[PDB]
Amino acid sequence: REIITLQLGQCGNQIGFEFWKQLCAEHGISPEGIVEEFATDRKDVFFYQADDEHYIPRAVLLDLEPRVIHSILNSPYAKLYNPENIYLGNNWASGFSQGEKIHEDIFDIIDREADGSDSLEGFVLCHSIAGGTGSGLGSYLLERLNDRYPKKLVQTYSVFPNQDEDVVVQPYNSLLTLKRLTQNADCVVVLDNTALNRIATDRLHIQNPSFSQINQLVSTIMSASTTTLRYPGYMNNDLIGLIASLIPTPRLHFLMTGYTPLTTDKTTVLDVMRRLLQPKNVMVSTNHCYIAILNIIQGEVDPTQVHKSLQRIRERKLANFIPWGPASIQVALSRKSPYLPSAHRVSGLMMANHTSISSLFERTCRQYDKLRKREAFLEQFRKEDMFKDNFDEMDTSREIVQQLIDEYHAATRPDYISWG
Amino acid sequence: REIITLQLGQCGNQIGFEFWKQLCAEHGISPEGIVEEFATDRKDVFFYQADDEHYIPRAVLLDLEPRVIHSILNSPYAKLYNPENIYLGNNWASGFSQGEKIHEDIFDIIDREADGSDSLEGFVLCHSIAGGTGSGLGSYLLERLNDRYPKKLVQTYSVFPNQDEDVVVQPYNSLLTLKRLTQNADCVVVLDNTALNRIATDRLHIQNPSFSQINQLVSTIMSASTTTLRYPGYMNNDLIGLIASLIPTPRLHFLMTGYTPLTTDKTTVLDVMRRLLQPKNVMVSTNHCYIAILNIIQGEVDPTQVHKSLQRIRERKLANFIPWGPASIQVALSRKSPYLPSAHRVSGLMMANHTSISSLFERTCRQYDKLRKREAFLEQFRKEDMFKDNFDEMDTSREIVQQLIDEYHAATRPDYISWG
Amino acid sequence: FILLKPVFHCLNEILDLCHSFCSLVSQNLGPLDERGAAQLSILVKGFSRQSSLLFKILSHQINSDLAQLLLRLDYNKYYTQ
Predict the structure, then answer these.
(1) A interface residues, B as partner, C-beta within 8 Å
(2) Residues A247/A322, Cβ–Cβ less than 8 Å
(3) Looking at chain A, which subunits does it touch, using at least 3 CB pairs closer than 8 Å as the criterion?
(4) C-alpha distances in angstroms, A406 versus A119, A401, C5?
């Protein structure tokens, strides 16, 4: 069933903008949405079909206090994305309150697309954690969608912000978003600003314009993560089928990423698997262990060697994991597209459940705890206090995220059969 | 299994460059690495196979304070050697310390090639003793490889520097390198700058540009020493199978070189053997004896005469040796290649274990001992002092090398059955 | 492997007991101990039994069949038990 992408907030809209541009170039689509003359892909999930070959994506662009959405409009791709579905603070509470007044009209925008599609599997949010306007509004909308569509599933390509720690209320904002995401989000794919910046310093000399260039890295991850859906295959021909192996237990639904040729600008499958398993290719910054690993390779891949490759990776034992879960790594294949450069003919990605990300969550909980004892930034703005006089949703989030940390470490323990 | 050559330091990179260029000309390879149109050989071991007949050697080129590696890059053969594996003082301690900080990335470069190969037998180092940047870094890397690859073996084409004795810290540097080499190297093939310079004066009038021309002599030795592996044969179809004959006891693993037509620019096998055993053809500068000798002949060699030649050499009794090991000499054969000049149709080489090299080691130990008493060149640069305050690894190296000297002379003795 | 009777006639019941379990979980979102717990514990033990049995059988020696083992051997999960 077709997927709708709910890109919201300035940062989220930037990355959804480029993701759709990336899939425009990758698929047979021109900047006006027309089928390309030069042009074997299952485009129906991600791109609505118009009568005159206008392949308009099912993007819902939500703007609040718009600045960069005007720049999105004055672009060559404005005709590409025309569902005509754009409807007009740096605090989580301010964003939540601003969303609450316009909830019905944005949800009627949701309804129109849901009705227009033949059918609907999933809501994919280009969400920004502690994103000022993005956060709060995204948490509210996340709480709304699951209620009205209980059967349906929500994925979140959360760009978790770690910039070496400007916004002073970041731990507070991120803490509340994580409570909403932990109980009201079916899946989350975690990304890290510092991790992508460190990769940027590695591959290039770019330091100062980190955001603009890191957007490309995020776009590559996001497209590669869906390529197996976007192109037919033998297995994982649907989102839920892919997602099931990745998330073995509901609480632990946060997924790390990695890409073998970080400098994608022949290599055998044995090489690309091992390259992927070292930490430099990973894009995320007491024993610790994976819960489950999955990998997809797109290229000129020999078939008989893929099984032998997994044999050899078992012999290498480069990925150390002894979790409660029994899920072993599986080597999957997807189709590299035509019309775009084929540099590094074989190129792969991994998506995995790891206990290490608990550390990144605990860092923002640590910042929050210190800030909470100080009460240096309660913000005390009349919006803030009137919305939350008790200031106890912060404590509810603290206990919920602490449960998540304990659950991660319990998954590390041998006895996650018992309650975690 | 395929061999990877770890060429490091300015001098080491120069000789590895020339060696790979020589094997390009010898094999069916162009400066662009494409198979020659004009072109039976085992190119698997030394040359990786690309899909488009790009025969890239498994060269690891390590540069430190690069000057000549830029000259290596601006060469016609730059496309020939493209694994894209080049990663950016005159003191051993400075080189060791500089190596330590970059050890992980260069080792990842090692890993990638070991992985891309179907399999790996050996690490062949174009090492430079007392080579400023080359030494220290080579000793550190030598210490790392054996630990990470305990089963695997390391050979060192050490160009031992004798220039009639500018660097004032040569004995100290060479002393530490030999300690690391004695305990952490499976094999060493020793070459001498004065010896090759003396041969240069012999065969030609070249005196001032010794280094540039001596590179060719070194390259001839290096290529001929591997020809039996590069070209299939009835015997010695593997490096280790050859190495066993040459190194009889683990400590005494330093090997003598010789070449029958030093002026290689018809001769019977009897003739080339009795020429080769003479000291002029030798390329290196109390009773003394060989431990074991081996000869490989490449040319228009009659088969029935080779055993008669070995008989004749046994009567002719040039090589005088009464070691603890029975190994005297065995006549081996390799194939002379096509497309290159066949001048001196029959042309031969010898690898041997000789006790004479103890003299050359003891000469640098003598220089070191005198320098140590004078205490004239401790260097005592803050690098040198902080890295080595005790200055006792010099003494550890002195006792280890003194053990090696005593072991050589004990090998001369009739009773190496007792501990040496 | 449809030709050989045992492997086929055991993988089929591996799938069928999973059908029954899928039905049991499908019944209710509320916790079910109404004899479901009893047959579920029986199910996990039985499925472990037959899964380990077919593991022993897997371990013409075709590359596909023998290589498929190491996916599960990654954890050594059933052998270790």
Answers:
(1) 266-268, 270-271, 274-275, 278, 280
(2) no
(3) B, C
(4) 38, 9, 48
